[PDB]
Structures are given as structure tokens and as C-alpha cells.
Design a protein around this ligand. Structure first.
Ligand code: SF4
Ligand code: SF4
Length: 214
């Protein structure tokens, strides 16, 4: 559990404009800029050089402080790789060029339920797991609007709060007993033991099982 996370997902805002029935959203608003600043300071103290995204289960382009937050990543963690995951409904050409200049290296746009292109990827939405490994808690930290740290993007209900960055350094949370044993337990495939993982049907995302098939 020594290796730092390679991706951190930050819920800079919790609302999304869509109502996708397949999404946890169906069925506060924005992250305190002070809270985002202490996260930047912590990530800066680690010389963080992995990926950073701005979407948990909300639409980042709805965040009124998005430009500020993106600009701060370039100041605090210029080695990191800022990525926007967005439904695209707010992504005008102007926002795109502005966000790119501020530091975003990639936009992953997903046309969802309803209704710079080198840096734009366009997608369109369109039991026995008890022993499966999973490497997500070894690679990914999630930070919610209120600062809670989760081991996975699946934990919408925050069953596995590892700590809170408003109260503790994210490196210390990442390396605490609870997070360390969890990622070890999931690396060994003990999904059945976790209330988060035991019913999870992730088979392709950071699993040994992923080399097979298709
Ligand atoms: S656009 Fe994405 S985050 Fe928003 S409701 Fe749909 S699936 Fe959920
Ligand atoms: S098994 Fe599922 S819920 Fe558990 S850490 Fe992996 S992806 Fe997340």
C-alpha cells in the first residue's frame, strides 16, 4: 500500500443537470473554495504528478469556481494531469478553449440520457464476484464536496469514508490502517468481506480479470 494514488477525483460540485435513471443521482451544492485550496496544498506537498479529475457524480462545468480551481491545479500541481469528465451540455467552444488554456489536458464528453478535439474524447452512453481482485483502492482516491475521502468511484453512499481532508492530510488518510488494509484486502480479492465491494460487478476496471476477454 506504499504507492500513492495515481488518480484523484474531486467532487468540486455535487449537482448534475441530468436525471439519468441508471445514475446514483437518480434517485451541499459546491465545494468550499477554502476546502479546495487545502486539497491543492496537500497535493502540492506530495509533488503530485498523477491524474486529477473534477467529477464524482456531478457535472463539473456547473461549478461556478471551475476556472479558479483549474487554474490552481496548474499553480499547485503543474506536473499533474487535469481531466474533465462532462456530459457536454455546458461545453461551448469558449469554455473548451478557456479550460484548455487554464490547464485541462483532456475532455471526456459523454452524451447522456435525454436529451480542441484532440483533447476531446466523445462517448455516448448507449455472487462469483466475491473472490475477484480489484486495484481501484490502490490507484484512486475520491474527495467529496465536503472533503470525505473514499477508496472508489462506486462509493456513492460513502460506505467507506477513509477520512476527511479538512481534518487530516490526504497522504495520512491514504496510508492509515483502514485504507491500507482495504486496498490489501481488495488486492487479494476479498470483495465478499466489504459491504462496498461484495455486490460490486466491476470486472473490467483495474482487476486481474481484465485481460480476459474481448
Ligand atoms: S450526466 Fe452523468 S452524472 Fe449526470 S445524472 Fe447522468 S450519469 Fe449521472
Ligand atoms: S470491487 Fe467495486 S466497489 Fe470495490 S473498490 Fe473495486 S470497483 Fe470499487
Amino acid at each position: 500500500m506504499d504507492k500513492l494514488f495515481s488518480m484523484i477525483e474531486v467532487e468540486v460540485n455535487s449537482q448534475c443537470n441530468r436525471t439519468c435513471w441508471y445514475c446514483p443521482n437518480s434517485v451541499t451544492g459546491e465545494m468550499d473554495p477554502a476546502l479546495y485550496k487545502t486539497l491543492m496544498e496537500q497535493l502540492s506537498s506530495l509533488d503530485f504528478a498523477g491524474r486529477i479529475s473534477f467529477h464524482f457524480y456531478g457535472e463539473p462545468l456547473l461549478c461556478k469556481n471551475l476556472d479558479l480551481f483549474v487554474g490552481m491545479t496548474t499553480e499547485y500541481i503543474p506536473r499533474a494531469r487535469p481531466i474533465i469528465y462532462t456530459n457536454g451540455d455546458f461545453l461551448t467552444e469558449k469554455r473548451l478553449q478557456t479550460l484548455t488554456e487554464l490547464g485541462i489536458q483532456k475532455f471526456i464528453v459523454t452524451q447522456h440520457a435525454g436529451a480542441d478535439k484532440e483533447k476531446v474524447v466523445y462517448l455516448d452512453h448507449s455472487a462469483s464476484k466475491a473472490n475477484m481482485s480489484c486495484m481501484v483502492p490502490s490507484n484512486l482516491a475520491v474527495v467529496t464536496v465536503l472533503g470525505n475521502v473514499l477508496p472508489c468511484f462506486e462509493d456513492f453512499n460513502q460506505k467507506m469514508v477513509m477520512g476527511n481532508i479538512g481534518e487530516q492530510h490526504i497522504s495520512d488518510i491514504w496510508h492509515n490502517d483502514k485504507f491500507t488494509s482495504f486496498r490489501k484486502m481488495l488486492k487479494e480479492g476479498h470483495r465478499g468481506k466489504s459491504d462496498l465491494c461484495k455486490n460490486c460487478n466491476n470486472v473490467s476496471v483495474q482487476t486481474e480479470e481484465q485481460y480476459d476477454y474481448v
